[PDB]
Design a protein around this ligand. Structure first.
Ligand SMILES: Cc1cc2nc3c(=O)[nH]c(=O)nc-3n(C[C@H](O)[C@H](O)[C@H](O)COP(=O)(O)OP(=O)(O)OC[C@H]3O[C@@H](n4cnc5c(N)ncnc54)[C@H](O)[C@@H]3O)c2cc1C
Ligand SMILES: Cc1cc2nc3c(=O)[nH]c(=O)nc-3n(C[C@H](O)[C@H](O)[C@H](O)COP(=O)(O)OP(=O)(O)OC[C@H]3O[C@@H](n4cnc5c(N)ncnc54)[C@H](O)[C@@H]3O)c2cc1C
Ligand SMILES: Cc1cc2nc3c(=O)[nH]c(=O)nc-3n(C[C@H](O)[C@H](O)[C@H](O)COP(=O)(O)OP(=O)(O)OC[C@H]3O[C@@H](n4cnc5c(N)ncnc54)[C@H](O)[C@@H]3O)c2cc1C
Ligand SMILES: CC1=C(CCOP(=O)(O)OP(=O)(O)O)S/C(=C(\C)O)N1Cc1cnc(C)nc1N
Ligand SMILES: CC1=C(CCOP(=O)(O)OP(=O)(O)O)S/C(=C(\C)O)N1Cc1cnc(C)nc1N
Ligand SMILES: CC1=C(CCOP(=O)(O)OP(=O)(O)O)S/C(=C(\C)O)N1Cc1cnc(C)nc1N
Ligand SMILES: [Mg+2]
Ligand SMILES: [Mg+2]
Ligand SMILES: [Mg+2]
Lengths: 583, 583, 583
């Protein structure tokens, strides 16, 4: 007995637990479509309006769940539209399978309609990149692609000539290897190495623990190490929320999508424990230029000593290692360094609250995010686009271990807010989901607001309309000789865009309008998507990478100007607190 | 004395006559931005809302004018968004320069933010693909890119580390080679070869001349050869309009974006003169399977004998060769073959008019295109998206040599309607410009309706809203076993989308609504863009590749069903006319 | 009724006039081998000992005859061994077809033995690069590859799964387009532009005509223009021989594989006519820094203004353009510039003769090449390897239009001497063929001396054994601060290598041994290959790019050291001759 090869391919996807996949049909992929059509009860096809949104959503599925995301594109332009999401998956090292339509084998290499050698298109993005040429082996090739995407934490691409999935193959020969999949059991971190790292950390005068998302399983240990040892915590931006933002010794992140206390403390630290962290600004920003000892914990040999000359680098799991450190230490009394950092954080959080707490007047991003906080459930998921929203969300969202947030961390493709939210709601239909996006990024993927409507995905979309590429405008202010260019543009009314795709929506431009609009949105999103278009000022957010508050470091005139522009009259530099506690 | 390298790069663009260019800024391209900002009087930067639209518009500039189109994208995701337009330019063999942002040379290869080796990304699409590494040679590298894009009729990509354009270079050293550019003077076609081709063509019983856009300069000669010799004309779809559609012996195009008379005549012809033609369906459709002699005229040696075994292939310019044929022939009396084809065309055009001429009821694509015809100026330009609109526009638009029409001919990327119209209006601000697009394709690039508003580009946008990927639905009807999938979707109200980007718009769903809406649109578009969202039926357009009208070829039941579905009761098969005139 | 697809492929090669092709069999290409075996009376397979030699020989075939060269390699390592020859073909812009074995379609993408995705391997080198997936279209794919390689003057690569050539296909369907082949049209010169060019050339005070191999059809015109107008000639190294070396106003080539008079004159010229020339050193050596007017003639628009800004650029065939110049000028009287250059050439040639004319003592390269000249037929063909031999052969070989010489002009891969001579003897069995090679380059392809023996190809191989990479040693002398490294090595006795492959051979180390050995070799090579291993001194050949003879430019100490090292006591700088004639 026989099975169509395409039917077998869909059963391989099912065997691996793929719940949903994204794409747009075409003749060159209609035989995979045909197989999907027969399997609607067991795999859920999501028709997007642009294939980039399918690729981005597949990446987001894997970011959220750790399960492979799946997308497809038709021959030629369908597949090339996947690129921004495939590069996101590559750079954020998450498993994605991409299927690319191709002309049948009888027409390949004939220079027929929309027929090209597609393999070179995907060679750079993909861990695995093959054109299938046989029906009987096609299930194996898909299985191989999936297994490699997982093993190698990246993108597998298969170009499929459209004739193959309509061929009959023997029913009993194909298989999936999902049944073999497992995660490794690791040795203990060695006691001796943990031990010497630990002594160096404890001997420090001005220690910091600086973690990334490799420490995602270690939030409890991080906070308890911090509290017991009196060592402040800082993180990469993506690692926000691993430790609750409310934790009083959480300094935030460094560089620009950053918080003041983290930058200031890092400049003063003598020892940094760098754990589960691949911070891409380390070298270019000279982050560690005056660090005395640099200690690392990472699971990947490729990372050991990568970002700075490392005194001790432990190849181990972050949680297991941090637990092993915790088990060999005990209480230290409060130190001046601890107290100075606590005071600095309190001052900073008072500044952010002063921005949030305005009650009337021209709307700024700060109050919009306060309004999000006010309607957010404790386990909400945030899909965040790319721009000033990363900076502002990093400062204002009040996250805990129960939340998730995703963006395009390293490729930093705009437009990911909408697709990430689609994926979040598909995976977690009982959890509240936000899409927080600037106007520039929302406009790139705006058509796929219709996908939220079509699939009844109750995302709360919040568009930050400044009529700018604000993140880039501020860069031009900093570097460009000549006038601003390409960074200020006409308005788009996203409430009207929403209406056009048949989504309920609101537009607001005044602080006092927020509470009732956000309460209405919270309620609508019990059952249907909603959009809030927040018309915000062009105020530049405080640049944590260009602080002008320390009279030993900056002129009085520069400090006065900084305080004025950034509403920062009550911020004190870290040195004030260092001095207060005798450092 | 010195000049900034970026300033020199902009002067190279100016030297080559580049009027306008497209892109979105980013830090990684802010030094090119800076140079553009100082040169606003002499080069016009168009800020798009998605970089794919900039790439597509650059391709369209070159399709329209023959001048190189220019676009750019920021590092990583800005550049990868260009792909669908770059592949369009490659496949439609038009010159485009693409500039890609990159991290400064001091941070390249550090694994910093959004920093990657960008060169492999563009290797497949590009004729020329380099990463610049020196400021003093950067003007030369841009000059080289332009010169190669022209010479090789394709895409040149330059990745530019952002530090280089801010470096000073000696003022007197750089140059542009635009001053050297010229077009070749060719020899005559040889008299002997033209002569033997001509005899074979004239000896035929059932000749056809089948031209593509390589014959774009030869419309006069084509029509006069046809009339003098009594030889019907057929074309590739893109070659519509080279000879006026009204010409009574213009049969149309073959395959699917096709007209009935062309398919039918081609099946019967004994000799085809294939001129300036690279029809991609030739082999797969067995177009020439019963052609006795196949004659070719083409400028490119790579094309000689490519699509079919060729009896005589003349390497020459199409116009010069067709003129040389015309100069050696004279009047032939009407033949039965001529008369049969004339009769067949009249019957077909009566069918199309019957569809157009309905006055009331549910709106179909056919009447929308009649309404376009009624408001179109004689020299209007049409940017056409990808889908059923190619099929329907091919049949219904009444073009002459004074018109232009463009689509993505071979890559066939959806979304090109909007960008092509932007480019058309930028090049030809005094000419009427239409964007004719299906709902699927319009939705992919809908955000760049805002670019038409921002730049006050008075495009007439007509969206054909069937709530389907209709072209693909019909494919699934033809090939798929299982139910339709991914081809029927929710409505988007493009009048509301238009309102959201601050464009005047209308939505219509009834035939009787068309005249006043189209008259209003015609008037608005004297000064501002406008959009008409035409809600059309799901009726399948007649498939010229699956005709069921000939009782020697098809069952009576199949013919009855075809006539019913396609409103084709009064169409006669070509064989009726052949018989009438004694063949 | 049916034909094997492999048989049809070989028939395509035969239709295109392929006489011989090179490679090494493997399982992965045994079905093409089987088809070759059946066709061995009409197409001739040459089994090489290393696939690189097959690729190099294929490139040399095309360099010599203009006929596409054909090579193949087995899957994986057979094909990757082709690379140095394929890149040679790309860079020297000659047509080559390369066939690459691949696993059968049932085993592709299974990760079986020596099975990989081969398409990305060839993407950079190839103009056309496809994996065949169907037997019936395989003849067309090969035809396409050939037609493109010719039209685009580069490499076409086809990966062939081994099952396809053993499949039956319909006998009637396949064809070759060889019948339709034509070479590109030759554009014609604009008559105004040529008149303006001529005027500028004639108004020059210190003109030069500087041609490359694009002027290979124009030697008569070049020499006559030089004589009529009293304008010296210089060329690219590859263009040596287009005008006979004995012509008294031939200055030679510039840069390093160069002759003194050319460098010196170019530095003083006010007007250069740059014809059929893509000299790669133009910019980096600042060749044209002081040139007032630059006049260019080239067929390729990609070249116009490439190497320097043009004052007049003519997109036309070199011989037609030079003929048109010649036709509008008449005899001009001698000038001071003309006489100064003639005197400089005489002085230079007397130097070279002095080196050649030694009759006893330690053997130098110079006398070896004199001995070559003494046994060389007037229509001899020289295959030249890469290193000091290019420099020395350029100075000493006495070539005329009746000769050919080839090397790897631009990629400059060592090892080409032996394959180029194989190809030359295959294409020109009645012409004398030399392989002139350094010991380093001969070593790299030494095993294919056996191929000359096996096919009874009577090449005269001359190996220049200095026990050095001499060309590179001299570079280290010029740039490196530390001691020589990697450039002096142990001896290989190539007369023993030749004995090992069963080739007659001689080793010489003294000038007085040359005449008898070379006469013996001349006679042996009436019927069989022969090798002369010339043990030469480590003397550095005079560096034409670092002249130290002009006491206005150089210290007496540096002049005296140069004269002593290079036996150049009788050389005078061009300024001596300029001054004699009042310049
Ligand atoms: C517009 C924008 C601007 C940005 N700018 C900033 C900025 O100013 N500041 C900032 O902080 N970020 C910024 N980012 C994000 C930044 O680009 C990097 O993605 C981020 O800093 C790196 O975070 P990470 O190290 O947590 O994650 P990753 O780069 O994913 O690294 C995770 C590390 O954990 C290790 N690992 C994984 N699992 C384990 C385990 N079980 N045990 C141990 N180790 C493990 C990995 O091997 C790896 O080294 C920005 C993002 C955007 C969108
Ligand atoms: C959705 C969609 C469906 C389509 N399906 C169809 C269809 O059913 N039917 C159809 O006809 N098209 C169809 N097309 C277009 C099709 O893909 C090809 O692009 C088109 O048929 C080729 O047209 P062409 O030969 O005129 O142009 P090109 O492919 O650009 O070829 C031009 C030829 O002219 C030669 N040339 C150039 N200049 C000269 C000169 N001066 N003198 C002589 N020769 C010269 C070139 O060398 C080349 O061979 C479709 C397009 C779309 C978007
Ligand atoms: C070890 C080594 C060192 C070398 N160093 C030197 C050196 O010091 N000096 C030196 O001179 N060379 C040197 N070379 C060779 C050098 O690398 C270049 O290959 C050579 O200078 C370029 O020669 P060309 O312009 O004649 O050929 P090409 O680069 O092949 O250019 C031919 C030109 O002719 C044009 N053309 C073709 N047909 C026509 C036509 N019908 N009419 C008009 N134009 C036409 C083409 O478009 C092209 O621009 C060296 C080679 C080796 C192996
Ligand atoms: C234009 C832009 C950005 C502007 C985003 O504008 P938004 O309007 O979305 O956000 P805001 O800052 O105004 O709130 S940020 C980004 C950097 C971080 O890479 N770039 C460059 C960029 C350009 N194009 C794409 C597709 N993705 C990108 N990341
Ligand atoms: C989905 C689709 C098409 C549907 C277009 O839907 P539209 O709604 O735009 O048009 P209509 O037919 O309903 O009037 S046509 C096309 C073929 C010709 O390639 N494809 C495949 C396709 C898929 N994705 C992109 C970006 N471009 C493509 N060409
Ligand atoms: C090693 C070397 C050269 C040394 C050649 O040594 P030879 O011993 O052959 O010649 P000679 O100079 O001693 O007479 S020249 C060359 C340059 C021109 O590229 N290179 C670099 C080189 C290195 N490797 C290969 C395969 N090809 C090359 N061209
Ligand atoms: Mg914005
Ligand atoms: Mg549609
Ligand atoms: Mg040597």
């Amino acid at each position: 007995t026989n099975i169509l090869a395409g039917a077998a391919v869909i059963k391989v996807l099912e065997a691996w637990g793929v719940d949903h996949l994204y794409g747009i049909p075409g003749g060159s992929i209609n035989s995979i479509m045909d197989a999907l059509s027969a399997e609607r009860d067991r795999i859920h096809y999501i028709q997007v309006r642009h294939e980039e949104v399918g690729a981005m959503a597949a990446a987001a599925d894997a970011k959220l769940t750790g399960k492979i995301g799946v997308c497809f594109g038709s021959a030629g332009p369908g597949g090339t539209h996947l690129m921004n999401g495939l590069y996101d998956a590559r750079e954020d090292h998450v498993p994605v399978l991409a299927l690319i339509g191709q002309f049948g084998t009888t027409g390949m290499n004939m220079d027929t309609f929309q027929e090209m050698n597609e393999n070179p298109i995907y060679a750079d993005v993909a861990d695995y990149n093959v054109t299938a040429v046989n029906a009987a082996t096609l299930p194996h090739v898909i299985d191989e692609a999936i297994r490699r995407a997982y093993a190698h934490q990246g993108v597998a691409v298969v170009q499929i000539p459209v004739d193959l999935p309509w061929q009959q193959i023997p029913a009993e020969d194909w298989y999936a290897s999902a049944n073999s999949y497992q995660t490794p059991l690791l040795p203990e971190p060695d006691v001796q190495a943990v031990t010497r790292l630990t002594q160096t950390l404890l001997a420090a005068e001005r220690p910091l623990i600086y973690y990334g998302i490799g420490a995602r399983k270690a939030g409890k240990e991080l906070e308890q190490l911090s509290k017991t040892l009196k060592i402040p915590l800082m993180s990469t931006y993506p690692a926000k929320g691993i430790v609750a933002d409310r934790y009083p010794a959480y300094l935030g992140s460094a560089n620009r999508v950053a918080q003041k206390p983290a930058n200031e403390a890092l400049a003063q630290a003598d020892v940094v424990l760098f754990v589960g962290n691949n911070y891409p600004f380390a070298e270019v920003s000279k982050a560690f230029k005056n660090t005395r000892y640099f200690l690392q914990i990472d699971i990947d040999p490729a990372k050991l000593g990568k970002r700075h000359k490392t005194d001790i680098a432990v190849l181990a799991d972050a949680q297991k290692t941090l637990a092993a450190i915790l088990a060999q230490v005990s209480e230290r009394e409060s130190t001046p360094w601890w107290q100075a950092n606590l005071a600095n954080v309190k001052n900073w959080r008072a500044y952010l609250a002063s921005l949030e707490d305005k009650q009337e007047g021209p709307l700024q991003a700060y109050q919009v995010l306060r309004a999000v906080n006010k309607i957010a459930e404790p386990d909400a998921i945030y899909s965040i686009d790319v721009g000033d929203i990363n900076l502002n969300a990093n400062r204002h969202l009040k996250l805990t271990p129960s939340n998730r947030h995703i963006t395009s961390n390293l490729f930093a493709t705009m437009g990911v807010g909408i697709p990430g939210a689609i994926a979040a709601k598909l995976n977690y239909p009982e959890r509240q989901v936000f899409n927080l996006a600037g106007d520039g990024g929302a406009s790139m993927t705006m058509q796929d607001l219709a996908t939220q409507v079509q699939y009844h995905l109750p995302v709360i979309n919040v568009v930050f309309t400044n009529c700018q590429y604000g993140f880039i405008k501020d860069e031009q202010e900093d570097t460009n000789q000549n006038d601003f260019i390409g960074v200020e543009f006409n308005d788009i009314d996203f409430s009207k865009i929403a209406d056009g795709v048949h989504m309920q929506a609101f537009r607001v431009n005044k602080i006092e309008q927020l509470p009732d609009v956000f309460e209405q949105a919270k309620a609508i999103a019990q059952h249907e998507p909603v959009l809030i278009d927040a018309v915000i000022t062009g105020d530049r957010p405080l640049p944590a990478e260009k602080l002008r508050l320390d009279s030993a470091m900056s002129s009085a005139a520069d400090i006065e100007a900084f305080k004025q522009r950034y509403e920062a009259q009550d911020l004190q530099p870290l040195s004030t607190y260092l001095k207060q506690f005798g450092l």
